[PDB]
């Protein structure tokens with residue numbers, strides 16, 4: 001477990017060294033300035049001052065000796081036997097380390113132990129931590145809260161959750177938190193059935209991985225040049241969301257896009273098309289999710305076979321079947337045979353858990369050689385200041401720490417990059433053939449490929465560069481923009497060939513807009 005600590009240490013000491021340079025300050029002044037930017041929420045600002053108190057004196061002497069973060073953290077025993085992040089010949093590596101020895105020479109608390117043990121299960125099971133009625137929908141934003149699924153309007157009632165069939169069409173209280181309830185004043189007719197009946201409502205559900213949940217570390221947290229108090233305001237919400245931003249993803253996103261592009265999420269297209277689908281979105285996605293381990297949390301899916309509407313399900317395991325952290329990485333890659341066996345088991349679980357009239361769309365896997373081609377000679381946020389860390393050096397560093405999320409594509413071995421894409425193609429064809437030659441009772445099966453090159457063409461006509469489609473910090477996942485151009489590219493395709501999956505526009509939208517408006521928001 002030295003990798004995660006070693007990485008974290010090098011990240012922090014890097015920020016420290018760089019904040020000192022940006023402001024022409026001392027190492028002490030930088031550490032005080034760093035904590036100054038962090039918020040108090042979740043005790044982050046307290047932990048900062050503690051670490052400065054515990055390690056500050058040692059860090060100041062080492063950085064004053066021109067040592068870089070990687071050497072510092074190996075001297076401070078945060079990195080254990082070496083992995084270079086900055087260029088340095090091994091002879092120069094030994095001297096600096098031997099010079100650091102002559103200079104220098106959590107949840108266990110009984111009162112905090114159990115809540116730690118309680119938080120662990122809620123996340124690991126992919127269920128909201130704040131959920132009194134245990135309907136898996138929450139009134140809280142993060143901790144698997146309503147950022148991932150529609151917010152719960154009645155947290156006390158375990159029969160009230162988005163996607164539920166109208167219970168007597170909500171004469172007295174909103175049954176599915178979709179913002180429509182009550183009766184028509186003129187005629188005494190329930191608002192719900194008046195508006196939403198016969199429209200064939202359908203929900204959007206995501207079975208995906210980190211990319212599906214829009215994993216995103218803001219580069220602002222790592223670029224000292226533009227750091228401020230406003231850089232870390234969203235840090236507490238991010239940590240409690242597992243560094244995921246599903247509210248902004250391309251599938252289950254419901255917030256306005258910061259990126260500025262006009263494309264909207266599938267859920268937004270879904271809700272826009274039929275105001276009854278309001279809040280009928282679910283993000284059943286976890287970091288590291290693959291065809292092998294989806295079963296370990298697919299139970300978090302909340303959809304009752306009898307009391308809920310149909311659903312549009314997207315199976316989006318877009319890499320972890322080829323992307324792994326092992327040194328001998330190819331053996332860990334899922335084979336087409338294992339891919340077939342794992343998906344069929346996953347589909348079988350859905351036919352037993354999804355109401356009839358549902359639809360499942362299998363995503364293909366993209367050609368991840370795009371990662372190295374676009375980024376290998378560009379500078380990681382931690383290297384942008386002094387232009388001393390390229391994504392190539394960043395991939396090698398992570399590889400050394402056994403932390404590289406995709407040894408197959410985030411690699412300088414072209415032969416392996418090709419080998420990894422070939423496997424990604426073979427797995428995509430398996431998903432294609434399944435949708436064609438496999439039939440199920442409660443839903444039909446379709447396949448749309450990723451086709452990253454198509455999204456790049458759409459991006460280049462817009463005046464953008466391909467490297468602007470990848471998360472800057474990890475250089476691996478697609479960013480908010482790429483996710484939306486994909487969701488758009490997917491939505492258009494299903495429309496042109498399988499419009500019944502999405503349905504057809506409900507003409508009461510305007511009549512629902514006229515009467516209810518925002519419908520309680522999200």
Ligand SMILES: *[C@@H]1O[C@H](CO)[C@@H](O)[C@H](O)[C@H]1NC(C)=O
Nearest residue numbers: 329330413414415416417419
């Ligand atoms: C590149 O990857 C291939 C496939 O795993 C392997 O056979 C080859 O030895 C690798 N080359 C180097 C220089 O590691």
Ligand SMILES: [Ca+2]
Nearest residue numbers: 135137152155
């Ligand atoms: Ca609830």
Ligand SMILES: [Ca+2]
Nearest residue numbers: 154155157160
């Ligand atoms: Ca409820």
Ligand SMILES: [Ca+2]
Nearest residue numbers: 170175176180
């Ligand atoms: Ca309702």
